[PDB]
Structure formats: C-alpha cells, structure tokens
mmCIF file of C-alpha atoms in Angstrom:
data_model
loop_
_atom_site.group_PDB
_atom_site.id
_atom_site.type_symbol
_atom_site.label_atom_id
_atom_site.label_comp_id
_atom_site.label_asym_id
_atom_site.label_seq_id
_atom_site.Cartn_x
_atom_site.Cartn_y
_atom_site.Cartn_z
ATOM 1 C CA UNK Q 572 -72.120 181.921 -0.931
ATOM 2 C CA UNK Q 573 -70.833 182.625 2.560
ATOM 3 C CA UNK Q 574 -71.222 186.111 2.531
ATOM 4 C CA UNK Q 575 -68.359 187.072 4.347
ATOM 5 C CA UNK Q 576 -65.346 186.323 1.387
ATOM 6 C CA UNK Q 577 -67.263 188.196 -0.873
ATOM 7 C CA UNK Q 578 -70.362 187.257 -3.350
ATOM 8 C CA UNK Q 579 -70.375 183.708 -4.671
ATOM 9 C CA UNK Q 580 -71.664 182.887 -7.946
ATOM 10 C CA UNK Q 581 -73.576 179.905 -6.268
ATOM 11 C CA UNK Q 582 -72.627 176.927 -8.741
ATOM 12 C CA UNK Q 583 -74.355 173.539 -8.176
ATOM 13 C CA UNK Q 584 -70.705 171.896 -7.519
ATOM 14 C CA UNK Q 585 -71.272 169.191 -4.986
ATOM 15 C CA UNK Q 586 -68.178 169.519 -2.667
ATOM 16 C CA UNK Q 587 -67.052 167.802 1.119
ATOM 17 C CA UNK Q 588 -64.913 171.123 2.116
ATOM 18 C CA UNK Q 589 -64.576 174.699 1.325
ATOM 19 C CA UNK Q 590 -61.404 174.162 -0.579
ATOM 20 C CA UNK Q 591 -63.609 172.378 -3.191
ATOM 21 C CA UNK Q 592 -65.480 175.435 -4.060
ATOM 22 C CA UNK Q 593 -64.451 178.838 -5.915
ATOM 23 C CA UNK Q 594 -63.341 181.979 -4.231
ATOM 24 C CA UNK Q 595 -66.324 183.667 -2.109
ATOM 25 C CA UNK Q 596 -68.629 180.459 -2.053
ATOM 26 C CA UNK Q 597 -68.406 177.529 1.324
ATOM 27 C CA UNK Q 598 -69.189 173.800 1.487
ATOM 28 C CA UNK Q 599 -72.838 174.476 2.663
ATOM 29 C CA UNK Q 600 -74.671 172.261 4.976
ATOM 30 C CA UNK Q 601 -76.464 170.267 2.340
ATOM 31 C CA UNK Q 602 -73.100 169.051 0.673
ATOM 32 C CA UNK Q 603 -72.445 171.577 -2.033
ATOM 33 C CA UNK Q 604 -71.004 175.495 -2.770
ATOM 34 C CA UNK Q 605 -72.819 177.947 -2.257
#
C-alpha cells in the first residue's frame, strides 16, 4: 500500500514497477506490492 491511491490489499506479488501491482498498492522498496 502507498497510502496515497487509496488502501491496498497488500498481496505478496513480487513486482519491478508500480504498474505490476493492483490499483492503490506500489512496487515497495523490498521488490514487491504493497
């Protein structure tokens, strides 16, 4: 979750951008959505 768009439901979907991940969640620091 990145706060900002909204609550993600913070899925353990490994990811290398934001585009990989659903609506409200980011490509977090660690490699993943959250």
């Amino acid at each position: 979750s990145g706060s900002d768009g909204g609550v993600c439901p913070k899925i353990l979907k490994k990811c290398r951008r934001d585009s990989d991940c659903p609506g409200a969640c980011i490509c977090r620091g660690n490699g993943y959505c959250g």
